[PDB]
Amino acid sequence: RPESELIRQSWRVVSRSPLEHGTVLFARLFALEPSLLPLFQYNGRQFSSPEDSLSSPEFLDHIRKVMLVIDAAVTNVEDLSSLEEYLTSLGRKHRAVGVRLSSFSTVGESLLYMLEKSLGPDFTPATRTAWSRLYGAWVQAMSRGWDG
Ligand code: HEM
């Protein structure tokens, strides 16, 4: 695993300011799949527009949480067996919140977007494919929360 090094290396750029970078991730997500917006219901209110989410302390705390789970998957990039149980649970919580499993493919595209934009010239097709591999394994794990 040298592609493990490619993940470890790229992530370090992004980990320096996780809320900045997570903000790009979720802005892109809403641009591709606007129907995700109502699933963030804090105090029983719905955001009207994507920009409304960026003022919400609870939504910004969710971005921090997301970046923490990714950082965990990176730390255990060599063996993802050790997060499997936690990820099944995380999946079930999201099934319960109303997230469809198909929407996690959008998430993966939004992560690769955010990496591409952050790393520019450094984001080689080798690293695109490493991250695709990792994320596909990560979603495989989460997928059990929808049974399977
Ligand atoms: C695809 C769209 C997503 C939506 C709509 C969504 C929505 C939510 C909502 C509504 C909650 C409960 C409220 C909260 O704690 O803020 C939640 C919790 C959480 N989400 Fe997400 N989420 C998504 C993706 C992700 C992803 C990709 C990750 C991680 C990589 C993640 C990590 C978390 C964590 C760690 C929690 C707290 C779970 C717990 O321990 O109870 N979420 N999400």
CATH of the domain at 96: 1.10.490.10
CA gap 37, 53 in Å, rounded: 8
Domain hosting residue 109, numbered range: 1-148
**Ligand 1 close to Cβ of residue 133 (< 6 A):** no
**Ligand 1 close to Cβ of residue 126 (< 6 A):** no
Query: For residues 148 and 88, is the Cβ–Cβ distance under 8 A?
Result: no
Helix (H), strand (E) at residue 2: none
- H-type alpha helices, 16-99: 18-32, 50-53, 57-75, 84-97
CA gap 80, 5 in Å, rounded: 15
What's the domain count of the chain? 1
Mutate to test the pocket of ligand 1, among 28, 33, 62, 83 (most ligand atoms within 8 A of CB): 62
CA gap 129, 137 in Å, rounded: 12
**Ligand 1 close to Cβ of residue 94 (< 6 A):** yes
**Stated resolution in angstroms:** 1.9
Q: What technique was this entry resolved by?
A: X-ray
